[PDB]
Amino acid sequence: AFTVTVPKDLYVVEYGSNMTIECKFPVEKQLDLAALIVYWEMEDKNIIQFVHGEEDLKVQHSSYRQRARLLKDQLSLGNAALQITDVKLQDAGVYRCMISYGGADYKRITVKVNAPYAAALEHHHH
Amino acid sequence: AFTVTVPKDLYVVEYGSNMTIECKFPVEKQLDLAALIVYWEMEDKNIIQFVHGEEDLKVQHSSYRQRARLLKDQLSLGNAALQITDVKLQDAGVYRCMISYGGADYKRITVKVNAPYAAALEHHHH
Numbered sequence A, B: 001a002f003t004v005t006v007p008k009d010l011y012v013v014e015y016g017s018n019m020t021i022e023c024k025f026p027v028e029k030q031l032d033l034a035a036l037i038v039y040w041e042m043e044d045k046n047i048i049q050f051v052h053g054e055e056d057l058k059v060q061h062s063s064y065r066q067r068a069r070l071l072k073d074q075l076s077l078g079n080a081a082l083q084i085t086d087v088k089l090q091d092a093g094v095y096r097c098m099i100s101y102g103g104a105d106y107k108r109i110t111v112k113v114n115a116p117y118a119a120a121l122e123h124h125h126h
């Protein structure tokens, strides 16, 4: 039974920081890269599409462009780790990691973003 | 490139009717049932979990008990059709069909439920 797990289903991050959110999947000693698909989304927006051992950047949502990547050196450990740089208030929400590696499963992770007044005021208006 | 498609991304259904919502996936020549996974959810409620050519009812949300099924004769034609019997107002929302058949993809379907006053009043009080 193929199961994705999360060490944390909640992250609380500061505006302007970097965050790495993690999804674990079973890898028995050697990764079959050809079989692996890793997909991350939030609110139906494509963040990562990792297929055939490479990230496909073409259909990544504009909000994550040049700010989101998969840490590929974690995949051999069975860790799908999404790193987002320079966190914004619009990054708060529910993320899903969808993994195919023989079997298929997904998990949800909630991200909360703390921000000072000036950042919040910009978000509130625009 | 493995792609799931939907003939309709919107269904408008009457309270008390039956609905069948459809996701299509490519099947060339013959279906390899052992490789197929079909999952249906709405709002994080597990509806259908079809793996190893059988439904796993243990993880199904209680509100879909004896009221939701996957039309298995459709699968060899590349149609994942979810039938829900006796539609309620709680069935309105966004559904996802997630399919693994070599590759993996999903699609969203929106369902709107029309209901008369009496049914709406019960739902409103709940």
Ligand SMILES: COc1nc(-c2cccc(-c3cccc(-c4cnc(CNC[C@@H]5CCC(=O)N5)c(OC)n4)c3Cl)c2Cl)cnc1CNC[C@@H]1CCC(=O)N1
Binding pocket: A003, A004, A037, A038, A039, A046, A049, A059, A098, A099, A100, A104, A105, A106, A107, B037, B038, B039, B046, B048, B049, B050, B051, B098, B099, B100, B104, B105, B106, B107, B108
């Ligand atoms: C039967 O059992 C279960 N099956 C699944 C499941 C089943 C099949 C496949 C997948 C799956 C896997 C990997 C990737 C993708 C995928 C998705 N989207 C794209 C979209 N890209 C752009 C394109 C264009 C826009 C768009 O709309 N599409 C993509 O890139 C093409 N790849 C997917 Cl769908 C999953 Cl996750 C999950 N959960 C349960 C099991 N119940 C769930 C519960 C919850 C906790 C648990 O423990 N269990």
